[PDB]
Amino acid sequence: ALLRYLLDK
Amino acid sequence: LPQLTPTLVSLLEVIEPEVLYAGYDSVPDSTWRIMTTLNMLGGRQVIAAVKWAKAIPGFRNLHLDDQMTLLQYSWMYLMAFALGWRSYRQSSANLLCFAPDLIINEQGMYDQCKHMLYVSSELHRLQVSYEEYLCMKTLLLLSSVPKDGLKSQELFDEIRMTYIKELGKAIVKREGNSSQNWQRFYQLTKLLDSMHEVVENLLNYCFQTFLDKMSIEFPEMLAEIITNQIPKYSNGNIKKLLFHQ
Ligand SMILES: COc1ccc(F)cc1C(C)(C)C[C@@](O)(CNc1cc(C)cc2c1cnn2-c1cccc(C(=O)N2CCC[C@@H]2C(N)=O)c1)C(F)(F)F
């Protein structure tokens, strides 16, 4: 999720 | 005039993350805070690593799940390598240059310091250039895949094979002596393979510290990636791509 958000920026 | 037309390497050159600082010269030199700082620093670099990743041409076209997997698979490779390269350049394969404000002499971290210093000296020995290093480092991002395969697998292998040719061109742009090129390709890609074995010894220590912890401070980004990979590593769902199979 943390990684997920960062990739989806 | 056509130096305007950017190559793939000049692109890789301009997305390399900026140097990060442990924020570290209280003052006493304890296990806990040095480890804690390294944890905190590893978080920021993983965070760096992602922005970097998301700039690598081809890394976009792959599936979001495919993007996560590769970062969770390669994060320790990228750090191990980067550290090596910096220790190589800043101190001729002799010191452990984590950041300008954190230069670790040997000393714990035996298995770590040894294995980490190996990488660095190998770079020192081969006298790897910066373009070489950039291609090689991108390749490490693409070093491992799930055994059930990436969603955008067919695409993945297309891009990875492209970035090999680039490490090829880096060697060629360096000189192009003779079979000297062949031998260089051999030795460089061999080094990349040894990375698999180095990261493993580093990944376990990292888990051992994470689990056997006793108390030690860890950042969000690493905790997740760690907690999320332990079952992946533990079950063998990883397939290490090597150059010399
Ligand atoms: C790994 O197990 C250990 C082994 C020995 C130890 F002393 C301690 C550990 C711990 C597990 C306890 C703690 C760690 O903090 C270790 N930290 C680091 C390990 C490594 C291998 C490199 C590290 C750090 C912290 N910075 N760099 C570093 C140095 C240079 C570059 C980079 C880096 O990322 N670049 C590649 C992608 C972006 C950035 C760059 N663009 O150049 C990272 C923990 F990784 F978080 F787990």
Side-chain angles (χ1 to χ4, degrees), chain B residues 120-139:
Chain B
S120 190
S121 52
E122 280 296 285
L123 297 166
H124 176 248
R125 173 189 78 97
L126 293 168
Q127 311 188 12
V128 179
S129 67
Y130 188 45
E131 304 186 346
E132 290 186 331
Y133 165 72
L134 286 166
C135 305
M136 278 168 91
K137 177 153 69 62
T138 309
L139 288 170

Side-chain angles (χ1 to χ4, degrees), chain B residues 16-18 34-43 45-46 48-49 52 75-76 78-80 82-84 86 97-99 104 108 113 116 133 137 202-203 205-207 209 216 218 222 226:
Chain B
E16 185 65 22
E18 192 74 345
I34 285 182
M35 303 235 100
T36 292
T37 51
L38 281 179
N39 295 335
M40 297 315 156
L41 174 49
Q45 314 234 214
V46 173
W52 170 77
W75 67 275
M76 186 61 66
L78 304 186
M79 291 199 148
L83 165 48
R86 305 254 267 245
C97 296
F98 288 88
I104 279 188
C113 201
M116 295 168 323
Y133 165 72
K137 177 153 69 62
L202 297 182
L203 275 186
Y205 194 97
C206 179
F207 304 147
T209 305
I216 188 178
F218 263 85
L222 293 203
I226 289 181

Side-chain angles (χ1 to χ4, degrees), chain A residues 1-3 5-9, chain B residues 50 54 64 68 71-72 220-221 224:
Chain A
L2 202 82
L3 170 57
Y5 187 75
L6 194 59
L7 287 151
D8 227 271
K9 278 196 164 195
Chain B
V50 184
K54 211 206 300 179
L64 220 51
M68 296 173 119
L71 291 141
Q72 295 165 328
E220 286 177 353
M221 192 56 68
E224 279 198 0

